[PDB]
Every structure is written in C-alpha cells, then in structure tokens.
C-alpha cells in the first residue's frame, strides 16, 4: 500500500547524514512523511523503519510519543489553539467557543468536508501577545472571538 | 561493605544496589520495575527507603533502593514511617486505574501486584473517579494480552528488547496512556516471548495454553523436572491438575537456565494430554487388541521372549538413562542398539570425545554469558538450542558492560551501561547454510554448505596455529574475512566455540575442535559447546551401542526374531520403508512408549510407558550434566484402569519375569545403583539427586502447596470415598501437601517457589543465597566428566569444496523451534504456530528448473515421491535444496543427504 | 552565512578547530526540554529522562561527553569573552552576575520582555516596565518563573 517517494527517501537519507546514529533521524523522517501526506500512516511506520534500519516498534513508539506527529488522518488545515495558563488568563475559552461555533466540531475532531481539524496545544511561546493560535505554519496572536471567522476564511 | 538497615548491621556486597542486597538478606522491600536479570531503571518508584547521611541523622531522604548502591557504611530505613506511606501511595496510584478483574484474571494467586498491594498494607480505596481502559491485541497462540491490568513498570519491553533482542514489542503513547505491545496484531516473533508471563508482574501477558485449561497456583501439583524438548536441559516445574499437565513454569537453576525458558520448552508440553496416548498394555491377536493388566502382560511377554532365540533392543535419546540401561540389561550389551542412525551416532560420539577428551572446558549455560567472543559453526542455535542463543546475546552485550565498568558505572545501572555501549559489541561469527536469527547481533554471518563451513573452520584454525592443517583454494575475500575472524578470536580473553550435531557434518565438529585447540595452544581461556539433538542424546552416546542400521540389518537377515523398541518412532532415524519391512518381518515387536507411533501397527505388544510427567529418571545435558527429573502425578489416581508405568520399571520387571518367572517391579535407586555399577562413565548420576530416603528433619518434600483444595471433592464424581494417597517409593517427594517446601530447607530440588507474602515467580528470591545468583544450597545436577588433562590432536581430514552435481540436490537442514522436535510438534498448540512445509530453492536453481515461489515440486527420496511448495531462498548456495527437519515425512536424518529428480508437480 | 564567511566548518579562523552546527526541529513535547530527555529525543528515541549519575558531561549524547545549555546562557557567553570577566562582574552588585531577560505577562498594560540586571525588584518590573495591571483589574498573585 504505502511506498516512500524518491524525494522522501532522499530527504530521510540526507537527515541520516547529520547524525552519528541513523536512529536519530526518526523524528524528522516522520515529520517529512507528515509534511508530504498530512499525517503518518502505518505503512509509513514500516517504510521508515526499513529505511532507518531500526524496528517498527521503535518508530511507532516515537510517533505515538510526540503529539505533533499525527497517526490519524487530519483535515487540510490544522488549527492549534493554545490552552495554557497565560492564554487562559487572556481568555482562550472565548476563542475556543468561537472556533467550535464556526466549525461545529469538538476539539480533536475534523470537519465533515475535511477542511479544518481543531486541536488544543501547549504554550506556543507567545504569551505576551496572547491568546495565540497556530494554523498550519502561521502563528496568529491577539485573538478576539469576532476575528475568528475573518481568520478562518483565508484558509481554503 | 557495611550497611545499617533499621538499626541492624549487615555485611553486603558494595557492587550491588540496596534493593538486591536487602532482598538477599531476607528483608522485604516492595518492587515492580527491577528484575535480577534486567537491572535497575527506577521506573515504578516502589522500592523507596529512607537514607540517612550518617548515624546521627534524623531527617533522611527518600531514595530508590534499586538505584542506590549498597556502599560501605550506608544507613537506610525500610520500616520508616514516611517511606511506608510513600510505598503505600505508589500502590494506591497503581490501583486507581486497575480493573476489578482478579476473579477472572489468570494471574490471581500468582500475581506480584496482588502480593505487593497486600505487603504495603493498602486495602482502602478513596479514589472515586473513572479508570482508564485499553483495547487488547492478538499476540499469537501462546501469549494472551490484557492491557487494562498494566502498571507501566516497563519490565516487558526491557526484557524483550534489551535482554532477548526481540524487535516487535515496544511502548507506545504518552503520559497515562502508555501502551505495551506490538505495533499491530500478530504473533510475537521472539523465541523467548514466553518468559513474559513471569516477567510481567500483572496479568497483562498470560499463558494462553494454560488459560484454556486454567487453574490457580494453589491447586497445582508441581514437580521439579527437566525439559525434554532439546539437549539444553532447562529446569522446569510442570504443574498438573485433575490428571492432566496444565502448565510448565520456569524452575530456577542458577547454573543452567536461571530465569528463562524458550518457547518450545514452555509451550510444547501438550503431547502429554493427548487422548490417543497408550494407557494400558495392549496385545494384538489376529486383528483384536486385547487389554491386559501389568502382571499378565509381563508374564505373556516373558514367555514369548523366552521362546525366542535372540532378542535385540532399540533405545532412544528420548528415554532416560535408567530406561536405556534397563533395556540394555534386558537384551544384553551386545544386543543393545542406540536407535539413532550411523552418521548421527558418529557425530554424537565425536562431540562427546571433544567434550571429555579435548582438554577444553565446556561451560554451563549461565557461564556462556561471560565469554568475550563467540564463533558458532554450523549450528542454528536459535532453532535447536535456543537458550544458548539467549546466553550468546548476553555474552555479546558483555562489551558494553566492559566499557561501562571502565567508567566506574555499576553493573545494575543498565540504562547507563546501554547508553555508554551504544552499538559496540563482542564479536559474533555465525556460519550456517542460510541466515540465522542471530544475524542481527553477529559481527559476521557465513552462508555456505557444511563442507564450506568446515573449510572456514579449518582455515581459522590454521591461521591461529600453523601446526593445524591448511586449506587449499581460499578466495582473497574469504581469506580477508577469515583474517578478521582470527584477529577477533586471538585478541579475546575468553573465546567460545559453539558447534553441534544438527549440521549433519562430522567435519564441522572437527573444525570447531581444531579452532578450540588452536586457541588453547595460544594460552587463551577458550570454551567449547556442543549442541546435541534430544534431551538424553549425550547419555545415549555415553552408554553407547550399535546404530539403528545394524539393528535393522539384524532384523532383516533373521538373526534376531524379537525386538524391543523403547520410546523410539524409528522413522526419524531411518527410512520408513526399511523400518516397516524389518518390523513386518520380525515375529515379535514390543514397543514401550508413551505416544501413539506408526510402528505400533506392526507391534505385537505395546507397553504404555510413562512420559516425563508420570515418570522419574535421569537425563544427561549437552554439557555432560546429569539431571534428575521427578514424577509430577500418579496417572492411576483418577483413572484406576490406567496402567502407565515407568519404562525402566517395565523393562526391569520384564527381565525379572524372563529370568526367575516372577515379577519384581523395581525401586528407582536400585536401577541408579545398577547404572553406576555396570557403567562407570555414568557414575555421576548417583549424585544428581538424593535417594528416596532423603528427608528434611524427618519429612518428605511436598509436591503441592499447603492450600491445595478439593481434597474430598476432586474425585467425588467417581466415588464419594476418598482414595488412598499415592505412595512414592521411587523419590523423596510425596504426592501431597504433607511435606516440606521451605526456602531455607537444605535441599537443591525445589518443586515450586512459594513464600508467605510472595505468591508470584518473585518467590524464587527466597530460595537463593543472593538474588539472581545460585540456589541457597547449590544448584541441582552434577557434571559427569571434568576437563581432560591432555587434549586431542589436530584433525587432518579437511573436506573438499562443495561442487553442485547435475540431478543431485544436497539437502540443507532448516530447523524450526516449533516443529523440528518430535514430541513438541505432536502438541496441538504447535500446529498453528508451525508453518507449512516449504522447500527452499536458490533463485538461480529455481530459474533453471522453471519454478516460481509457491509452486509445488515433487522429488523422490528413497523411492518415495513427495511434493512441497517452493520458497525462494536467496542466501542458500546453488546446488542445495532446503528442507525442514523434524516435520512429518522429513526425517532429521535427511540432513546432508542427496536428492534426485526434483521435478515440478 | 557563518559557513560562507568561514566562521563554521573546517579550520575556523585558521585555528584548526572543526565545528559544524545543525538545527534539530522538535515534535511537540514539553518533557523534551529536560536535558537528559533532550539527549534522548536527539537520539531519535522517546523523550524519557535519564538517571544521574552518570551526568551527560561523561556519557551524554550517543555515550559521548555532552553539554546541554540554554539559549540565553550561550547568548551571554560572547559578551563575557568580548568585554571581559570583570565587566561581567561589574554590571550588577548582586550574587547573580550579569543581565537576564525578565518580563511580565498576563493582564498587564504592557506585556513584554526587557533585559534587566539581577536584583531588580519584581514590583519595579511590573510597574515601570509592564505598566501595572490593566484598568479595573486588581493584582492578586504572580508566578515568578513560568508554569
Ligand atoms: C520538565 C522540564 C522541562 C524543561 N524545559 C526546558 C526548556 O524548555 N528549555 C530549557 O532551556 N530548559 C528546560 N529545562 C531545564 C533543563 O533541564 C536544563 O537545566 C537546561 O535546559 C540547560 O541548563 P542551563 O540552564 O544551565 O543552560 C527543563 C527542565 C525540566 C525538568
Ligand atoms: S493483574 Fe493481579 S491485581 Fe490485577 S486483576 Fe490480575 S490478579 Fe488482580
Ligand atoms: S505489560 Fe506487564 S511488564 Fe509490561 S509495563 Fe505493563 S505491567 Fe510491566
Ligand atoms: S532451550 Fe531446549 S531444554 Fe531449554 S526450554 Fe528450550 S527446548 Fe527446553
Ligand atoms: S500560554 Fe499561550 S502562548 Fe504561552
Ligand atoms: S524497583 Fe526501584 S523504582 Fe522500581
Ligand atoms: Ca515414580
């Protein structure tokens, strides 16, 4: 079913050149596959294990340890809202309520069209500009519940 | 070192941590994540004690005793108040998510978590919230998975991955959702996965084969026995209930098989419970199989044997020393035959002569782990002697142990040792006809025919010592790899050469002997190990006798009219047609056996022998260690019609009824004394176990725990009157709970580990002098022979290079842990685990013959055309065909034989 | 840019010192910030921490001697080696030498970050730099150094 592409394999081997042990490239191999395909399927776990020379159990333990490596299918855009303490003081719950009202999903689910997936996340290191959100690669600060529909419709 | 625990002064080892030192002193500290064989990691935080800086310190500090060295002048407290509350809190934290599962849990009564919950005194629940749950996985036919009961102690992953070298088990997930298992559903691939049921302190991993016929540990009848499934001689505790064998537990032997079995020994006991087993003497008459009791069967056999002119005996390496000796006394030494083939016998005596005349010490199984370089020649040890492969893995990790010891890191801090020794390992060089399971840690693997492996061994011996014979025609690439092996072996302090008779080549054993001799001549501390085939192969070799071919010739010419076959199916060691013809020609065939075999159709008399569960005896190790196994249960206790005697009892009574026309059954010690009187080489089997008069302060050794239940109900459906307790005149054990099983009892044979407050396999701590060491009063079993003062000469018979001949296919043996052993492959749980019989082809040979993978090809061996599906084997050398030895229809005697007319079906 | 200018790579500044710098992007766990767990995650493993002793200075990343330091410590280093040790001791009359990035977050008037010497009063930061609390809000608690 799964097969690593030439670009994926080349990037994985190039990352393998940077370490004494080829096992050290497992996190970035999973991130490369996730960047190419949105998430990491099971055949990706076996293929990364075959390329790196480590067992699939170690690759799966790494993939399920780290929260930003997705082992379940996600939407086209991953909304990641900060639920930590400073954003709790700055009112992240209004932002979460606005997102749940706009998308009609619970945190951790994907919309019916596969466009957005909503996830709470730990502190984004932007606490002085809170509350904070992280869409696919863009960090949005100074969030208000009124600006959520404007911020969500620029991600088709 | 001097430690002060709770005001008392103790002398301990400074190289040990505090937990193992205090457990060796008899103090009770609760623990989960530490294991004596796995080291300390500090995960579960259960072993907390209060350490003080000096004698005049009142505050102290909570430390983990498994992670704290037992240094000199160390002040700790176990019964300190705060440490007790912390250990109870750790138990409570584990109990918050634990399912309400003890009545329907196979670990109940044998559970370390139950024992530690009771030991900390935690019995009141104040947690009121929900418990986390987990879905289970299918882990194959042997291990049942119940992830809800996990306490996240990481013992399974540490054992399976770091110790056993397995790759398909791991820890997944995160904070409180940690999941221990496989990445997907499937059978656990490790040959040592069965030890998880004792490694896991909870009921996550359970024995599925035991779970089919489950009973609790207190209801079991145990005996100390020896595993019969290969030659390694691992000590086991078979446990029965209601007349059937229900579990094989690991019995601790600090010299052999300390904590661990292989999956063959743990799960291949199911042939004992087969319903087609003979339970009575059966005599054929016309086409009627009449059932006799023991006395008239003995009388009829004695008169019929007396009417014959020559009686010959055919023993087996399955049978014990006493049974083979009783057969040899019944028929005479000149008429006794070993029952194995001529080439198999020649290889067995060569291995024995190397063992007790080569002048090189042969290590025990535990001692293998201390060798700094391993060369394995021809023996696929994972499929034939698996515990040796586990010990070789430990010996390979010895290099990381050495570099950690150079950095003043304690030997129990296993994570630091593994971090220092990342991938540096001791050299391992394995040679086989194909890839082995040891190739993941092997420094080099040599895939070649057995003559080429022997040539590699002789070249290694010649490069180590120029007095050894040379090999002509070595390619420069192979010469460079031989030089790599020689540089690795010469620089090693303790090289170990492992070989065996399973390769089917005499020259491989000769080459291994020459390598060992060349290393001995350089002053190295070289050890040699020989892997035999069956449980008492070495005892049959020591006793000696003619080969099976000579017995078949004697039957076929007509010089012998009576043949007595003891525990031998005769088809694994000879062609089926020759055996059938010789047994059909013979007017009297008597078969003394415990399994329904194909030669019982031509048998005039069948004597229902006992299996190892229902018999006593002695078996000789692959390292020459005599080990006594004891009867577990009386087979006539539930079924009174069952006449299932010991094989030596049958044969001694037969000899007595033949001589004096009267029946004297025997006692076991009489047969042992007869063995040590007539055979001086087997004189060490007297000291293997004490005789039947041995007592612990006047009382016998108990076979069942003190809380053994149902004593007035287990036979009540047959008769409301309780029967007589079975009497054991053979051994020092009693068939009851009225006996001794104290951990401080001065004995070496322990039927089962139990201590008050320790109901789990962790109860073996109380039975040892120090935890992870030896048994307190010595491990059972003695060595038959010591190291010879003088060695052998160099074997100058260097074999020629393998040349593929057209129309002839050399049979390369492919052994399997599940299937190649006879009795274990009769077990029903091994049928699913064993694979379909494939025939291995080189890609070039398959392309020449025009067959792809999975296509059935038919070949004629001994005038018999059989068909098998083709599996493509890349590593197999061309001109060879790969066959699975030990399966039905493919005898292990086929290893090294040729093969004609390989045609597509 | 530093590799192009010869400040990184082989034979830096003609000294003979070889040094290459890599950037290993994380995968989203807070425990990875712990130094032994950082070493474990750098080796491509699950980011469990390690027991000390042994310290990473003797056997750290891949069993080699290894030193793990914060970004701000390594950013403090070049000023020390460019201006002198006595300059670093003579910028604050406190037991902790040098400057430190200190800030106030929450519902304050000016949340942000400022480089201040050690021994600066927390009330001084909150009032002068953060501008105090916002209008209509009364201060009730504070955390000095994170969660
Ligand atoms: C749970 C935990 C999380 C930590 N996270 C970080 C972190 O994110 N960044 C950091 O620099 N240190 C973090 N640390 C501190 C490190 O263990 C270590 O002290 C530091 O990274 C390097 O030491 P230094 O301050 O001398 O440079 C964390 C410690 C713990 C216990
Ligand atoms: S694992 Fe032990 S404590 Fe848990 S349910 Fe089973 S017997 Fe009870
Ligand atoms: S499955 Fe068993 S051995 Fe493994 S961590 Fe859980 S309780 Fe420990
Ligand atoms: S290694 Fe051999 S003796 Fe030991 S448990 Fe396995 S089959 Fe039995
Ligand atoms: S608390 Fe939300 S960005 Fe830090
Ligand atoms: S036994 Fe010491 S922390 Fe687990
Ligand atoms: Ca008996």
XYZ file of N, CA and C and ligand atoms in Angstrom, chain B residues 95 98-103 105-109 111-114 117 149 201-204 216, ligand 2:
77
model
N -3.315 1.392 41.802
C -4.653 0.841 41.973
C -5.761 1.739 41.443
N -6.621 0.323 37.985
C -6.570 -1.123 37.814
C -7.979 -1.705 37.742
N -8.258 -2.585 36.783
C -9.615 -3.115 36.633
C -9.971 -4.107 37.731
N -11.276 -4.210 37.983
C -11.845 -5.089 39.008
C -11.875 -6.525 38.479
N -10.681 -7.088 38.290
C -10.527 -8.233 37.405
C -10.000 -9.504 38.054
N -9.616 -9.476 39.334
C -8.949 -10.618 39.969
C -9.670 -11.965 39.863
N -10.998 -12.086 40.038
C -11.622 -13.407 39.842
C -11.506 -13.957 38.428
N -9.050 -13.246 36.261
C -7.689 -12.970 35.828
C -6.832 -14.199 36.072
N -6.078 -14.605 35.051
C -5.245 -15.792 35.159
C -4.030 -15.585 36.049
N -3.734 -14.353 36.444
C -2.626 -14.094 37.348
C -3.008 -14.219 38.815
N -4.299 -14.315 39.132
C -4.771 -14.347 40.506
C -4.229 -15.491 41.337
N -3.646 -15.166 42.488
C -2.942 -16.132 43.299
C -1.500 -16.347 42.904
N 0.142 -13.430 41.409
C 0.294 -12.072 40.910
C 1.179 -11.261 41.838
N 2.240 -10.681 41.277
C 3.142 -9.856 42.069
C 2.467 -8.575 42.539
N 1.571 -8.014 41.725
C 0.863 -6.800 42.118
C -0.071 -7.051 43.298
N -0.748 -8.203 43.319
C -1.572 -8.572 44.468
C -0.730 -8.678 45.734
N 0.459 -5.201 46.820
C -0.654 -4.451 47.388
C -0.925 -4.887 48.820
N -4.688 -4.287 32.797
C -4.056 -4.628 34.060
C -2.636 -4.096 34.183
N 4.612 -8.467 36.020
C 4.132 -8.680 37.389
C 2.621 -8.681 37.517
N 1.897 -8.353 36.457
C 0.443 -8.341 36.446
C -0.053 -9.378 35.444
N -1.359 -9.371 35.203
C -1.953 -10.300 34.267
C -2.133 -9.754 32.866
N -1.198 -8.923 32.403
C -1.258 -8.436 31.027
C -0.907 -9.552 30.059
N -5.806 -22.374 39.474
C -4.976 -21.490 40.271
C -3.726 -22.213 40.767
S -3.108 -8.444 37.438
Fe -3.148 -9.078 39.648
S -4.164 -7.349 40.774
Fe -4.628 -7.109 38.532
S -6.642 -8.164 38.194
Fe -4.988 -9.713 37.790
S -4.666 -10.800 39.794
Fe -5.817 -8.853 40.222
